[PDB]
């Protein structure tokens with residue numbers, strides 16, 4: 001089948017996530033056919049550097065033949081059985097045991113789902129059920145942040161702070177509130193990042209008192225905001241958020257769907273930033289994207305509460321799916337046993353962060369060069385001196401994104417932020433290869449900008 | 455590694471869907487280890503007849519080594535790439551094209567998810583977006599039915615009509631309404647099923663008029679209610695429902711997550727009952743549960759509307775997952791090319807239905823014996839003549855279900871309804887084997903019932 005034929009059928013039959021279907025079909029979709037290591041190939045034979053690891057998720061890289069064997073094997077002995085009928089199976093039990101070993105102490109119990117979005121919905125129902133069991137039926141409001149992302153279920157879309165999502169579905173649903181994000185470049189004023197972190201955290205206390213603590217169930221946040229543009233909060237932020245949650249008896253929830261499983265060099269983002277959530281949600285890197293699986297890790301306090309509540313009338317047919325569990329188990333064992341997470345912390349992470357800042361810090365319209373471990377970013381700005389952003393935030397980002405895409409480099413544009421999260425197994429030489437291409441693209445971007453009078 | 459050790463680890467680490475964790479952990483979970491055809495084996499070596507096909511989903515049966523090979527091949531080539539970045543891949547394109555061939559005309563476009571619950575959330579958001587595009591922002595209420603089931607996301611749980619789900623999470627969310635279910639045994643009074651079908655359908659009309667039609671976006675229903683107990687509506691019901699929807703310009707949605715992919719003998723439940731929905735939701739049988747995947751099949755009218763609205767800000771990371779799509783393609787090809795669906799319609803379906811009715815007709819406390827294709831059921835009753843149900847609906851069903859499991863037969867109890875949906879590939883010999891066990895179990899049930907208080 002040819003490229004044109006694949007594009008024709010896709011256009012005729014397939015509706016994509018977060019896309020303008022009419023526009024995509026007119027332009028024709030790029031057809032990705034093969035993956036190896038940190039590279040992809042499309043139907044036209046182009047070799048491509050995947051600086052986004054699929055979608056923040058292919059942490060061990062492409063080409064894991066042993067994962068495929070594990071999946072083949074499980075699918076042959078027991079492709080599926082449910083966990084609804086007072087029933088279980090070996091794959092899900094073994095995964096549960098292994099996860100308990102790589103997660104912080106006090107996270108022994110896990111609830112499985114198919115996606116990060118379902119994980120978030122599960123977490124929402126869990127935190128509300130918890131307060132009901134505690135004898136506090138009014139404590140039901142969850143607080144998230146503007147520009148935070150927590151998936152695409154009705155629940156996750158509501159808890160998320162993307163107005164372009166809220167506007168489709170009559171969202172958010174009741175019992176959801178939002179505070180501003182800890183984006184220093186925009187909101188920092190004449191504060192240092194550290195003093196801004198305290199101020200941005202205290203926005204949470206302001207909202208809790210506005211609503212009434214007796215009505216607030218939880219605060220939920222990504223340790224680093226992903227889809228929002230890799231917004232890295234100041235070091236003072238999460239400790240203050242935690243102090244506030246504790247003061248007002250509000251549950252603290254980390255959404256680890258992106259930061260989870262080695263992304264920051266720690267196993268989980270909350271470990272890097274030094275707070276202790278009562279639950280956290282996961283997916284993506286849990287299986288390195290090799291098969292769909294998500295999870296909610298429930299701390300002991302919330303677990304006991306749920307357990308005391310009897311029946312928990314929640315779950316999905318494919319919860320604990322044997323094949324996905326078998327692959328996830330192989331992935332997590334690899335991340336640990338092959339020293340992949342440790343390598344991010346000790347070796348490739350520090351190297352990436354150094355080289356990232358050496359590469360982009362010299363560009364006239366790049367600023368806020370940032371990142372940790374193997375997630376990094378910067379922002380395209382009109383004038384660094386005034387911290388002035390381009391109008392129509394996102395239009396310039398698209399231009400630069402298309403230049404990357406044309407040059408067979410995948411880095412994503414989130415508004416005018418450029419972000420990257422490559423496979424964790426990326427070599428130092430691969431890191432340098434990617435940056436050399438990225439640098440060339442920014443030079444092309446800089447000239448294209450000046451040449452358009454922008 | 456022994457039964458005991460898996461049960462200790464499951465208790466210690468695993469939170470299951472729809473169960474009392476405290477009780478299960480005390481009693482011990484049943485460990486399912488392997489499957490072949492229509493049979494399962496547990497860690498204790500018991501051979502089990504799976505009369506529920508996993509969870510209404512293992513439609514081609516266990517042991518498809520060809521599906522495992524399709525999975526392996528795809529996972530080695532491209533285990534994942536996203537469909538977000540103006541990108542696609544051959545597996546999802548191929549599946550989309552095959553699906554268009556087995557779905558009714560006018561359904562050419564499909565949106566992928568990981569589960570039936572995500573499909574329902576997707577459908578809710580599409581339905582509301584569609585009406586926004588029409589310039590009718592108040593046309594946002596979706597109507598479902600009491601005892602309907604549409605998943606376990608916050609959205610799906612709210613649209614579903616299970617009170618016990620509503621009472622956990624503060625559901626339903628706004629813009630949801632419910633009408634009574636077309637359960638003739640309970641609500642039929644002195645009407646014929648056909649007369650009742652019209653009355654029960656008209657409950658939708660009176661609800662629309664109570665709310666106001668300009669505020670009603672859609673009616674959503676399972677052609678046959680699954681988790682509610684295989685409630686089979688009279689022949690007159692769906693045509694009247696459809697007539698009412700057209701009268702009030704209300705979208706009609708079939709939830710085919712169970713009835714889909716051959717369960718009734720047609721490819722889809724709505725084909726059997728002769729109505730034409732504007733969208734329908736799928737999962738389960740889409741891949742015979744071999745991997746998690748779901749879909750929304752979008753008809754031409756709504757597709758046109760979504761497409762006219764530019765960005766559709768919705769979707770999941772693993773939407774259209776290559777490996778899952780490759781396995782679903784294999785499954786759908788098998789259902790068609792191996793004549794499995796046709797065989798349900800022409801051979802095993804009629805046989806099952808005849809034998810089901812022959813088997814359970816004689817029992818004193820069994821009534822409303824029903825079914826179509828390879829979904830069938832009956833209800834345990836205190837007195838047939840009065841159509842008097844036992845009090846504490848569900849307690850007596852539990853008694854009977856337990857007898858089944860002690861005799862290595864899986865049939866589910868939904869309240870006091872006993873239900874069955876075995877793999878579609880079940881042979882006539884296997885049907886008779888299953889019914890011989892079940893008949894024995896019902897004889898024991900009548901015994902104990904009479905022995906300890908009818």
Ligand SMILES: *Cc1c(COP(=O)(O)O)cnc(C)c1O
Pocket residue numbers: 114115116117118120149150151152222226227255256257258283284769770771772
């Ligand atoms: C991607 C993502 C989700 C949702 O995961 P899906 O698998 O796409 O449903 C939730 N939270 C965060 C932080 C994410 O990055």
Ligand SMILES: *Cc1c(COP(=O)(O)O)cnc(C)c1O
Pocket residue numbers: 315316317318568569570571572574603604605606676680681709710711712737738
């Ligand atoms: C099982 C089911 C769902 C939900 O599917 P999951 O894959 O469990 O999320 C939705 N609708 C119907 C009719 C179902 O039977």
